[PDB]
Design a protein around this ligand. Sequence first.
Ligand SMILES: O=c1[nH]c(=O)c2nn[nH]c2[nH]1
Ligand SMILES: O=c1[nH]c(=O)c2nn[nH]c2[nH]1
Ligand SMILES: O=c1[nH]c(=O)c2nn[nH]c2[nH]1
Ligand SMILES: O=c1[nH]c(=O)c2nn[nH]c2[nH]1
Ligand SMILES: [Br-]
Ligand SMILES: [Br-]
Ligand SMILES: [Cl-]
Ligand SMILES: [Cl-]
Ligand SMILES: [Cl-]
Ligand SMILES: [Cl-]
Ligand SMILES: [Cl-]
Ligand SMILES: [Cl-]
Ligand SMILES: [Cl-]
Ligand SMILES: [Cl-]
Ligand SMILES: [Cl-]
Ligand SMILES: [Cl-]
Ligand SMILES: [Cl-]
Lengths: 301, 299, 298, 298
Amino acid sequence: SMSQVTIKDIEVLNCEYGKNTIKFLRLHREGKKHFVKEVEVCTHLRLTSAHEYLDGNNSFVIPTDTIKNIVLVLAKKNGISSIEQFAIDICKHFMTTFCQVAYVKTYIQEVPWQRQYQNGVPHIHSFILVPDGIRFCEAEQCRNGPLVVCAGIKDLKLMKTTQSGFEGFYRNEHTTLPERNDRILCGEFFCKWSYGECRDFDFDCIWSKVRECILEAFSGPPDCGEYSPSYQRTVNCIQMCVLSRVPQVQVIEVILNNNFYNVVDMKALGCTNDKEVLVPVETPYGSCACTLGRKKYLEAQ
Amino acid sequence: QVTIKDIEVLNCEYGKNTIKFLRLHREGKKHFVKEVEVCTHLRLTSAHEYLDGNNSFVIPTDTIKNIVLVLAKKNGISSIEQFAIDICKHFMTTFCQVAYVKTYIQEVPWQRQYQNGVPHIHSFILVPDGIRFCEAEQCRNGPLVVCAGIKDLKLMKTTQSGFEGFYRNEHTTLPERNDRILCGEFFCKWSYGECRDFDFDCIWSKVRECILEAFSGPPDCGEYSPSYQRTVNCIQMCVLSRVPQVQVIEVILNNNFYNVVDMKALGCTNDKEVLVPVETPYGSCACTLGRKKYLEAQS
Amino acid sequence: VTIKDIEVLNCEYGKNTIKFLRLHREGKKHFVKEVEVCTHLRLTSAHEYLDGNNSFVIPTDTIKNIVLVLAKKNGISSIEQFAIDICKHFMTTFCQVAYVKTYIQEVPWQRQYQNGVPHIHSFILVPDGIRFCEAEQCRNGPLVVCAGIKDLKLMKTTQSGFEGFYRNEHTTLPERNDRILCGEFFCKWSYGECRDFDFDCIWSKVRECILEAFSGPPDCGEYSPSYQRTVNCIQMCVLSRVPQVQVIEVILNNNFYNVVDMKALGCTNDKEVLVPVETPYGSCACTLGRKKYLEAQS
Amino acid sequence: QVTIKDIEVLNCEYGKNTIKFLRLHREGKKHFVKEVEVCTHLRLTSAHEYLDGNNSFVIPTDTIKNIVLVLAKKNGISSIEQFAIDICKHFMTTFCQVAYVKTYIQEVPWQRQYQNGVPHIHSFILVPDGIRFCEAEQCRNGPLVVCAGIKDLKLMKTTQSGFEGFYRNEHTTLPERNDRILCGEFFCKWSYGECRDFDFDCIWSKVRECILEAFSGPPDCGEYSPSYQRTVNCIQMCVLSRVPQVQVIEVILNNNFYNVVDMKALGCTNDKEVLVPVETPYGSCACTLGRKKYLEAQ
Ligand SMILES: O=c1[nH]c(=O)c2nn[nH]c2[nH]1
Ligand SMILES: O=c1[nH]c(=O)c2nn[nH]c2[nH]1
Ligand SMILES: O=c1[nH]c(=O)c2nn[nH]c2[nH]1
Ligand SMILES: O=c1[nH]c(=O)c2nn[nH]c2[nH]1
Ligand SMILES: [Br-]
Ligand SMILES: [Br-]
Ligand SMILES: [Cl-]
Ligand SMILES: [Cl-]
Ligand SMILES: [Cl-]
Ligand SMILES: [Cl-]
Ligand SMILES: [Cl-]
Ligand SMILES: [Cl-]
Ligand SMILES: [Cl-]
Ligand SMILES: [Cl-]
Ligand SMILES: [Cl-]
Ligand SMILES: [Cl-]
Ligand SMILES: [Cl-]
């Protein structure tokens, strides 16, 4: 119909920009005892207009360099009591300082530094990297909308060697999977939960409590464990534990990426392999994901 | 144009890489796991597969994988070191066309889960706090040598570290510093030579404790490091002083500088409060120390 | 005054210092375990005290016979397993037993060696700290096992002080940052009901923790600012490195070594000649337990 | 009634007992300890302190202690034998009134601690596996004689022992036995006479090796003992064959019989499995052997 499209022909469905992987360590000294919080911050903005795209005019653009500067200044002046409070302080600063900001999102993850110990005695200033699951949070706010905070844990890899099966599934001409009532259940978990606009609690304490719920629901009691009839059922058991034990959690998303461990057939090698040697299949891999919300929280919107 | 008689075969080696498996063991309802990654390489007495297209002497890399899995099944894995020994011994004593065998093993760092200080019978969590590995090798008619190690071990102290009194030249702009963050990623490897009259797990743990303690110093005051290099030496001398089984120790320290961000132009003072890691480029230092007694004793 | 005015707070009886050697032979090679056993009972009634009625009393002679028969029939893999077997035997054999406690200590026989070769059947007494254990059970309550080391005498010649202590008008002790630290230790630890480990292995591991924490590393040692702090270092080492230990009790009986004033004798004594003071002597004692374990009891 | 005229002084002797001290020596960071118990006794050339109440010639026992401590400080202690020699020589050269001096010394058995085969610079553990002692004595204008020994040495073998073919009378109920536990606590003491041209520590260790090897026999099979008395002879003949410095050797063996408990009345057979030691009463035997040449040469 026409030889080109012009602004009049097209709708801007989304415009977003920001600064990614702002890495720094906040050091706090109480005499000779040293405290560290090392983080990675992503902060993204949507502006009220798109002249920098549509017209080649930068008048309203806050440089991403400025976004980095603000994150480092706020760390210096405010410290970091929790990554959640820091994500909140960043979002509130952008919304209050810059009228051209329609929307702000701050994602933060912690570098998993632990204090070193010598026969139970905490070291004043020495640390070791211990990645047993990465702590993150995310704060976002629309102009004239609520400031919403999420916390989570990712790269969390749990494995139980029994009390796991997958049976009674749908069968068809392309379904060769045998029924199994014993197998290794190996999952890499991404867990993310919403507090909504709630802030009246200790962020670090509540995060720890959720992490506990995830490990406990996954494992079952330490003397006997608990049967899992699917990866999916195990995801629901985790979500329902967190919701049952942590009232501040309004919505919870859990993604389980599984690895199957095959009992190697050793008959041609002159052996019987009685669930002794198991080879992980890393690709392809199965995943399942569910998001559960409290009826009260969702209806209250 | 060029023929077999103009060229010398300096080296021929082949193997199977990244053989991954979990060895499961049950004592009633209590389950135990060892998950490993194994490389095994061979040198053969002839090179006909390369020079002539004749495979008669070649043990398939598929067979190397089958043997590793069969040995894990029949022998179990008490320690990765004993399993590395078992694999090298099997190749040496089974195949007369093997001139040399090398097995590398690394553990997947599964930890048993705890609820209220009670250990879980069959539930585990992945906790990398430094990757345990080992390596066994042997030439025909030569010692079976065992090495153990820890890698991807990232240690950081926020004080008791400087670098001063260095060599000055026209291209040297580095300031002298007596307070900086010391952050290093360590690769540590040590040889037991032929000795195996000790508990591999116990001695591996002891060397690890030596590394952490020599790095950190005492927990109430720490200990001043005047260079990355001096910290490497304190680790090595601590291990050799406390672990006679260690004959030779190699330590590599890959460091990250943490820069106190100049916040002047932002109207801020930064008194060592906000520090930015420089990941690339990065400094390295490496040292191998050996006991004179062990070195001289090799005829 | 009458039985009606009087409460029986406690009644207990038993057989003490039951001494025997259990000999085991694998062809030419002999193995020994020589022990001393005490076994005490509390009965469900006190008719022997209150009425002169012995109908419920198991003779202490029978307690000895039972200890000797079980050693014969069961052998002794570990003193802890033997103590368990004796408590279990009393609880299943005699319903009038309300409570049983068995204490066992090992006679410290070591196999003799000649130029590195172990002797098939010859031993030497080597007391380097006496191994003991204790098992006890109430009727329908848990069987609890403790192991320990006593008469363990350790000494370091430096890396010991006592400074910054409370001063008053009767305090003449000077501040010291260098002294001999000499202690006789009693150490006892509870496994609770946990029994799924090698008793000998774990005992050896706790012993090594005690010596290493007392001494510090062999190339430099470790400063002790008090006997009390050294007790704490030993306990925290054991608890940090041995998960099976739930509760640990350490008693340190110290001996002061005085640098003799030889000025009157025309001599300077630069910490060269030291005289030990055996009485009076100082003691300190601490019991630490895992919070998780102590909560799980209540 | 009776006066000095009617009575003869057969013997007078006095001294200081249990003088305890530690001698500490430092080579850089490395500490060396020798802790000893010293007894020093004198006979004087007169007895006026007893007979007349005149103390003019008495050296206070407090002075004997001061001299032992002063000599430890000034000389150090290379060996307890050299220290005992130095004490006797001091009393003889210093005091006109000394007719006779005897010095007895025993070592406190401190052993350096080891961690994973590494010797600790300054930490020790008490390990009493046979107490080292010595004794020096001298009459005025007579030879200074030195003895060394080992006591409280407890050895046990579980077979290769019997006692048969002994004298029988109407009061003899002991059965012939060809297979018993041989358990002895040994006191061994030997004389070097006046010879001192050797390493005292070296030679003491050699004698101790000889006692353990002769008691035990070879590690692969042992050696049959037909009595305690013949084991004492084997020990002595082994020392005299292998250690030419030893002129005279005394060995005292205090034995403990281990009874195979008769368990027929308890429904059991006891096939040398459970044995009970008899600590009292107890048998002893003692022999002193000397080289003909040294006994003639007196
Ligand atoms: O638990 C399981 N869920 C699934 O959806 C599935 N698909 N293959 N195996 C499976 N196991
Ligand atoms: O400790 C240090 N060693 C070095 O070699 C170096 N080079 N730059 N900074 C350094 N710091
Ligand atoms: O370490 C010590 N603790 C004490 O309680 C004490 N009392 N005197 N000396 C002492 N030394
Ligand atoms: O060896 C022995 N000697 C004795 O003199 C003796 N007397 N009873 N048993 C004995 N055994
Ligand atoms: Br021996
Ligand atoms: Br030791
Ligand atoms: Cl640590
Ligand atoms: Cl497979
Ligand atoms: Cl070839
Ligand atoms: Cl856990
Ligand atoms: Cl700096
Ligand atoms: Cl060396
Ligand atoms: Cl043995
Ligand atoms: Cl002092
Ligand atoms: Cl007289
Ligand atoms: Cl007999
Ligand atoms: Cl001989």
